[PDB]
Amino acid sequence: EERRRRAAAVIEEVEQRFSTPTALLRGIADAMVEEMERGLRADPHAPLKMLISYVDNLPTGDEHGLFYALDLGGTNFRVIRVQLGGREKRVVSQQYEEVAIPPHLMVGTSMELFDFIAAELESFVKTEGEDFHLPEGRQRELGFTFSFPVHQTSISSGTLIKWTKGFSINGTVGEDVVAELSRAMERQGLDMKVTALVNDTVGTLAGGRYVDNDVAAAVILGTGTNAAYVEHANAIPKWTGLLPRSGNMVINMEWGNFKSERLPRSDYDNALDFESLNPGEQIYEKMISGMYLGEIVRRILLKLAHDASLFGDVVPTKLEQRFILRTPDMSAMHHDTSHDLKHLGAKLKDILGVADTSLEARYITLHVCDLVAERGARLAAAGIYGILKKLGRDRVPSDGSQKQRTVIALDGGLYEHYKKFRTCLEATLADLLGEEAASSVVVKLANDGSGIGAALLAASHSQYA
Ligand SMILES: OC[C@H]1O[C@@H](O)[C@H](O)[C@@H](O)[C@@H]1O
């Protein structure tokens, strides 16, 4: 019908506003570096907070002993327990338990949340355990990974800046999250001391360098997105005090808050933000991260349903319901290669509650996913490139000459389980780099990286008991 061109008009503006020509990506990468410097001198209201992590020395390998970690993410939390054995034996025993965070605890009271966590820890610690031992008369020490922006005050203390993703708990901003976790643990009451507080990007970069000494930065691409890297302490103007022996400092960029007029946004992006739980915050992250991609697709699919009767002559009711299309569902449809888009069709039936779908409609749906997933992955690649620019690792020496080896640790369901996203990410990154510098850059999955990473940092910062 003539619908067909009204539908093409919509898809045309999507392609047009989501366009990321590499020329635009280089400009975005330059913008990201400018913001990393604005954040490092603590310019007022800089988008990138560039938070000093108090981690001046990353894991070496010569850590030994029994140490726990608590890993609080946007969707789940883990209770980890490792037994380290030096540079030779490394991780001798590992035990972990992962729990999904009940949705109400992302938006209730802080006591409700930390009591829920602490109680899962208390009962996990009692499953210990013949393989892990702690000298007699000692306290167990814990690494705390906190996947939200924290203004740090010591390796083990820090204030909450704001929540992100789907969390919004009153009365917790400004408070010390380790103190909040410790009272929960005494209400439990377990004798445990938190010796390291780290963001999940900072923890992933620790866990990553424990296995590969070439890790210079870690990027999370999961339910949220953020990045951390190793900066030279003498490159941080906002720094006060003695610099560290090592001369380095791991910076939590908090790059989801990146905003820039160069970012290719659309009305679907403004609508998502206007109805988000944190309006105006984390602009960049809402173009990239797993909490948001599926909802961008739903909002594009809904305009087509209405302006092009794409799914019938009445709009399916479920398609008007926010967050009904998650990002894993998007990923399942996007990877269907059956001649008639049979699986993508089955998902649309469940998600929209229709009985059947056209086959033109499924190709448009699949094209809508491709437009959304690829603007997110190309932009994430521009960010990684910016980090490399800031490390002077977008260039290759010079004479020629030994090339460096620079590893990036990645974690998150987007990078780990969304295959076209990861591919587009790495091809764009390689293409921003050059066949040359590219050969020196490694991108690794650093699974469950944040927790052992926190556990290891909690160790090098023990009270020796
Ligand atoms: O979950 C990964 C990232 O998501 C961001 O929204 C959080 O604010 C970061 O602290 C975290 O590193």
UniProtKB/Swiss-Prot annotation:
GO terms for molecular function: ATP binding; D-glucose binding; fructokinase activity; glucokinase activity. One of its GO terms (cellular component) is cytosol. D-glucose binds at residues 164-165, 199-200, 226, 254, 285. Its EC number is 2.7.1.1. It is found in: Plastid, Chloroplast outer membrane. Expressed in roots, leaves, flowers, immature seeds and endosperm. Gene3D superfamilies: 3.30.420.40, 3.40.367.20. It catalyses: a D-hexose + ATP = a D-hexose 6-phosphate + ADP + H(+); D-fructose + ATP = D-fructose 6-phosphate + ADP + H(+); D-glucose + ATP = D-glucose 6-phosphate + ADP + H(+). Residues 60-198 are annotated as: Hexokinase small subdomain. Residues 199-448 are annotated as: Hexokinase large subdomain. Induction: By glucose or fructose treatment in leaves. Pfam families: Hexokinase_1, Hexokinase_2. Signal peptide: none annotated. Pathway: Carbohydrate metabolism; hexose metabolism; Carbohydrate degradation; glycolysis; D-glyceraldehyde 3-phosphate and glycerone phosphate from D-glucose: step 1/4. GO terms for biological process: glucose 6-phosphate metabolic process; glucose metabolic process; glycolytic process; intracellular glucose homeostasis; response to glucose. CDD domains: ASKHA_NBD_HK_plant. It is a single-pass membrane protein. Fructose and glucose phosphorylating enzyme. Functions as a glucose sensor for plant growth and photosynthesis. This is Hexokinase-6. It comes from Oryza sativa subsp. japonica.
